[PDB]
């Protein structure tokens, strides 16, 4: 009569189910957010899916004869990725979309980051995504991204990942003299001129020139690569915590790592979409960025998807529209899991819990559901039925007790067509933090939830 | 040479004019916002307009032979509605649009609303639309909305409307102990776990189980309908003040009721559009929701209109664009009427008054007209001329003395095409309150204003 | 050996007991506080009790031969009422009194309420009883009371009750501009010049005169009745929420309505006293007003009772005194029921709960039981024994955790004679609010508690 | 229809009416509160009424043959006074009472007032009545009251009234050094050890003894009278502003003087009662004190009236009660007149104005009419009719805009019997101030209002 929210484990066991993920996803995912921390998820992911897919340039209508069982991908200037999988029924029927953003909050060098203050030389930054809690100091950082020569040569940078690479970080006054630093926790650490990349070793051939420490590093930075102090202007700032994601907990039930935010959904959605064979209705996977920053144009709210489903529908011309209007999406993004350290911030009930399956959010806004997509019950009911047959544990959540925190997912952006969207995703611990936590059971369950969205 | 604004009454009289609305609209409208308080305005309204209109599914090109004198409607998943009326000239010429949102601020059950605290059992909620003034307590509430079974069965809920139905409400500490509740009127009543639906009557067959009061209600809720504690997940939360709208004032000149906000415009715009025969240029009426929450996608800023004027233009294919660019709209929404209780909040002049006709708002933003549509003078002048010939009283207003309150109508959303839009609507008293007030004279005048937007 | 208060229901059932009140009192009471909201309880109640009772003017000693089985009532200028019922034993023995106040907090027009500000015309008010929480705005109001012509003609006013009567109410700034209204919830809505009774409809024959809207309403108010702008001076201000009391809750276990405060006790005490046949010791029921305002003279702490028990003892002369000294009273008044929304305001234990029977309050004061009657244990024990034999559920309560709220019942006022008094009554939800809640089970139980005070 | 009040004058003129008061009451009253400033109003008043009246000790039943046309007075330990006037009908019928307090706020010496600090010698005080605004400094003071020798000899003190008597007063720091005295106007002048009665003139025969200045004054105080430093213990402290009341204004339309508070009503009520011949129903005038301090026992809420109407009814024994219950009273006391210097403190309408006749107050309490008598409309209407026939201008007022100031008249104290009471009185300017202002027209009108309360 009354409803109870099952737990993911127990039900699992099976000796199979467990193994099928304990090491299953916690290996694939567990490693994904280690060798990919800067929206280059595209590369590593595009390398995968080598088991078919192409489109991109190979558009000859019959180059791959766009029809039943075909699979293609489209790259958006390397920052975004969208995958297709044609099915029996015609596109005009509808679609089965899975969406997720691959970007994540982080720090990143300014246009002229290199400067030298008091001997040592720092590197200007400018946080992105709203890490708000600037407790990004002390812990070890690594540099990623890319630099573009004036001639157009793209050089890849990745320092601090290998156990032999040096590391970087932001300093913070010692407690002994941090007395004056007490006003408002809200922010007493917020500048954008932090992070020193080199001490002494001053300088290059010791040929004078005030900024010796700086001069030296530029030269060191010149030997590797082939940049100049300029070039940074046309570079790609990327500071992220160093270290591979790890097993979290004495029972290895969780995973601690950077980027967990949605990148975990972007992954499960990937595998689900990847190992999806025999399609009844053409389904597609979208992976964009700029979500954490507002989802502005170019590579987020862009038409890259719009003017692509069409460029794909071409391989059966004119608008028709219905194509998108009759689709069903599952725009997923991580949610806040109930933390036993700060309970008064959530409503207990109506809150996602670590390990109770995949999360569903009918609405997610601010002062009165303001600015956000509101899933239709009829559609929700369907998902219920579906996630019942193929099983899979699911739970519904809300972000904090009513008037607490704010929300806004990219779910409404596509619903603008008339689709049936709803918010999904895994429950995380300490979001937007350099190290996030997740439940392997949830990761697993979520994937199955996605995969169980192939049929009907 | 010096314009002066005159009371709608007096001019009326005629013994006819009065009767033609005193009981005229105050009956139709007066009853509309009584039997429709939860965006089901679509249903009751779609039932009306039975005098023609259809489209929806009956699309055969010649199924109704889309041409002169034809009238059709389009339903948007029940949450939205748009009506057409073909005229002599071709669509490519332009359109005569009337828009309004049918949604209104209210409370509405969470995903897992049923819970039991200290004997009695409450129902979690989460206000929508920004009622900000949570003085939604003490007074009697009714439940509306719909619940969807896992199988897809749609059950309709409407408790608290009939004089024999029980009622509901939110409690508030008695003044005797409300002493500690003094800090910031801004909010000392704001939770989302209010509203008890049942006391004692504990429980069902008294078969133990801690949450007895709860268990009992779920069972009671099970006999009627056929839901379980779940299902709420795929339900449609809807708490609204109970009671029919009434005649307000010793002279029955005003109307007190819930939903007045724009639903009053949505109505006058309806009748105007409905009793509109012999069309020169094809005109259409739009009624969407989610306005009070931001007008997000799916059922507000969606393409439902875009990809529909076309699906309709089909019954003469290719974009052409001009169709929309050459249209004229009258996006209406209620405005704040000058309240003699709080005068210092408005500029006196440049403020709408109760009974001085239909209201016009050239602009309506915040700090410096920020974020809002600004009507063109050339278009305004035209409306003037028109609302002069067919008579009709009109007045121009501004929302509060400059840097007071904020604004933002869905007028700019359609002007994005290049249309000639302007803000209209009736003047209300205490907006977004469980009980709003309006002037019958204004209601009437407004309608005539709309209707007088048919030809000249 | 240990105690637990149990619940009223369960014990009931019997299929009879339930029916004997579910519809039993919830019908009588349920309707009482609907057709009587302004201390006219006297009238409707005096009309009842037609099954005997009279006294008033018919005092002839043998006019009704004051002796065994006689029943009479005494009206106090219509504002108060007291009923008697002679028993076997002589008055000199003692009495069995039941007391309660019939007045309740509300708004009410000043001496010169009618005025016109900015077109429309309002009506000055001045709350009574201490509604403190001026959240009496937005919701619909009705006018009651009486107006007295200079000649002495009493005209009755009752507008807003019938489904066809117009309504009234107090306005409040829309949230859009309510920003400046944030300081102290304690009071940012408190004036006494609120409530508009008429808009436009300006004016009467349009014969000029600045205050047209006003002039018109006075004329309208003149056609009905026959008053002038004066007369209000000798009128009886009475603004109360409109609408009949209703069934509260999905299980119709409670009742929501205005006046619940003590008027509920005044009723149960009535029926109990009414259907009380075969009296051993003469018992009497008192119903006064002005309690919510201090219980001042004229119709509260007056001698109306004193110089009446005597005027009645006459039908055996001289003081004797003992008559009152040897009586037992049950001065009842509603208490605050534990609200699951605001728990920290009460001590949990030692607090009345919705449905645990009739409430008993040994003491009820402020800073240290200050200013209030303290019931004697010997008397309390007796009541226990009694309410055990005839059964009836009872619970003891305290108003808020010690130093929280203040108290003061009219119980000590009669104990001044030496009587054995104690505080009784039903437990309510949100007291002094336009809409109060009560448990039918408690209503019932309370009555039985009273009736079970006829003998033993 | 509508209505206005207009200024008592104009209507007057008559050349008679004016003279009949311009010099009429402004002479009698004008002089009363000059030769009587300390509840010795009794003496001067008792000396008047020499035209009959006595009772007091002369109680012989036939000593004056208590019957038609008889007039007697009763003295209450000199602090209170009550006058009777038998009429045709029997006492059992009812009474026509006029009440008023004769006491007024003022300062008054402690039990041990005489002390010497730094040369000069002061006199301890302790304000009475709540002058709250301690702006009782700088201006000239006079001493009244009485001192009682141990033997019982009553000595009368009255210093500072004759143009040749010395004066007294309270000092206050010069503005030059009053800088530190800025915190809270609420009170930065509040001690009770102010008022110096003698400088230098140190001392008596210069026979040493530290407190010389003191010693000297005691001696000086000894020559006159015959007191010692003790005796003050059994003395009657009385400090009041010195000077006769005067004509206020260029048109001599008002009167400025001390004691105006109710003492003005106590006077008009006196003359009215005094020149009242041919009585239909026995009418009586009451004049008590302690009102400004709470109206406590002994000489205010005492039984002096109760056990007196009886001691008088004796000259027809047993309680009967009805005697008082069927009476009509006019408990009067000054009200606050609208001051053009501080308008925002009153509601404009519903406020008494200087010169618009006698004032009527249906209610006068605090937070919601709390603690105060509420006059019945039926009674009010009657007064209207009456004050219409005999003419007389009247106006209704309220003390400050709702939740402003507090109130509490001794009107409810007698209504406790069941009488028909209502608040009357003249409108004053700056109440409880050392110098109050009143309108001669109002004074006059009020008296006529009282007198016009003789028949029916
Ligand atoms: Mn995210
Ligand atoms: Mn995020
Ligand atoms: Mn709005
Ligand atoms: Mn609106
Ligand atoms: Mn009360
Ligand atoms: Mn009460
Ligand atoms: Mn006073
Ligand atoms: Mn006074």
From Swiss-Prot, chains A, B, C, D:
One of its GO terms (biological process) is proteolysis. The keyword Metal-binding applies. The keyword Glycosyltransferase does not apply. InterPro entries: M18_aminopeptidase_1 (IPR022983), Peptidase_M18 (IPR001948), Peptidase_M18_dom2 (IPR023358). Its cofactor is Zn(2+). GO terms for cellular component: cytoplasm. Zn(2+) binds at residues 101, 176, 432. Its EC number is 3.4.11.-. One of its GO terms (molecular function) is metallopeptidase activity. It is an enzyme of class 3 (hydrolase). Keywords: Aminopeptidase, Hydrolase, Metal-binding, Metalloprotease, Protease, Zinc. HAMAP family: Aminopeptidase_M18_1. Belongs to the peptidase M18 family. This is Probable M18 family aminopeptidase 1. It comes from Clostridium acetobutylicum (strain ATCC 824 / DSM 792 / JCM 1419 / IAM 19013 / LMG 5710 / NBRC 13948 / NRRL B-527 / VKM B-1787 / 2291 / W). The gene is apeA.
